């Protein structure tokens, strides 16, 4: 019974910039979902003191994968075999990971060579109000023409399984996939390096005869960076990106979560708040179609979402 383990707490994830991050428990985070590998019960059988280590170098996401345990069942005395935990994980990470912290640390030495993929879209800083540290972030649009992107995306996509309930891996040969990446800049040994923060995949969905309606598919801000404004920056940058294309109608999402809906409401209200069609005097007259029209034309906001924007803003202007 001590040989059944919850895989949501057994799987230990780290993003590593400095050798000491390996021994800092603050750096470790845990899946929200493991049911797609370990079933509805999210349990692995056969091991006491199970640790599934998935450690990633912060930028490149070069991977160390190790399964550790205190003891395990012996089919000779227990008459049952332990679960193939190692095989399950290898189903969703690419080959070539290292298997010990020595080798992982040697890869960390050259992490300065890691550079962000694609075209720079936006840079922003979180400036200290109090004379402390400032932090600097950048958003890129990347694709499979970028050297090393294909392999990096394979390392990255594993994180969707832990954090998006119904995540599936996309067909990267499909040319309608767009990729948006968020990086934090940081210094180490007098150099400047890039840490992966999160990303979004967007499907450039065809609307006959000659338009598209970009569909937000998979969006993830990695645990350590959540609730700090990055998700909002990312969705805003994405809207701003597609706003330059007349052939884009507006932007939607694939089966959005409650938390995504909340995020989207936040971003879209911010974008629309000072538009002429959403003035207080207009809001007080009730929803008008030209609010959807203006939101679509200015920011590629879908009509359904423009209506929510109206509701939220009407509530804001009243008591």
């Amino acid at each position: 019974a001590e040989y059944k383990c919850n895989t949501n707490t057994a799987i230990e994830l780290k993003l590593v910039r400095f050798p000491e991050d390996l021994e800092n428990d603050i750096r470790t985070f845990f899946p929200e979902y493991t049911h797609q590998l370990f079933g509805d019960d999210e349990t692995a059988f056969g091991y006491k003191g199970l640790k599934i280590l998935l450690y990633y170098i912060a930028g490149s996401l070069s991977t160390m994968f190790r399964v550790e345990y205190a003891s395990k069942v012996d089919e000779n005395f227990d008459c049952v075999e332990a679960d193939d935990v190692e095989g399950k994980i290898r189903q969703i990470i690419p080959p070539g990971f290292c298997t010990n912290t020595n080798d992982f640390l040697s890869l960390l030495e050259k992490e300065v060579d890691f550079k962000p993929f694609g075209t720079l879209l936006h840079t922003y800083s979180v400036l200290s109000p109090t004379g402390g540290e400032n932090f600097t972030f950048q958003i890129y649009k990347a694709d499979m023409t970028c050297r090393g992107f294909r392999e990096y995306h394979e390392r990255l996509q594993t994180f969707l399984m832990w954090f998006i309930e119904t995540a599936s891996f996309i067909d990267v040969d499909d040319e309608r996939w767009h990729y948006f990446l968020v990086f934090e800049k940081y210094n180490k040994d007098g150099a400047t390096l890039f840490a992966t923060v999160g990303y979004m995949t967007v499907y450039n969905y065809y609307v006959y005869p000659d338009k598209t309606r970009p569909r937000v598919s998979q969006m993830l801000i990695l645990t350590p960076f959540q609730g700090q404004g990055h998700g909002a920056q990312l969705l805003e940058t994405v809207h701003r990106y597609y706003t330059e294309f007349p052939t884009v109608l507006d932007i939607t999402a694939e089966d959005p979560s409650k938390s995504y809906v909340k995020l989207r409401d936040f971003v879209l209200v911010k974008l629309c708040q000072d538009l002429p069609c959403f003035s207080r005097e207009k809001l007080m007259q009730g929803f008008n179609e030209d609010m959807a029209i203006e939101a679509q034309q200015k920011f590629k906001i879908n009509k359904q979402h423009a209506r929510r924007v109206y509701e939220i803003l009407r509530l804001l202007v009243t008591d």
Partner: peptide, 15 residues
Amino acid sequence: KGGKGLGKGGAKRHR
């Protein structure tokens, strides 16, 4: 795993 253009084609969790 999902059909064409889908990234959320996996299983829901049923505790």
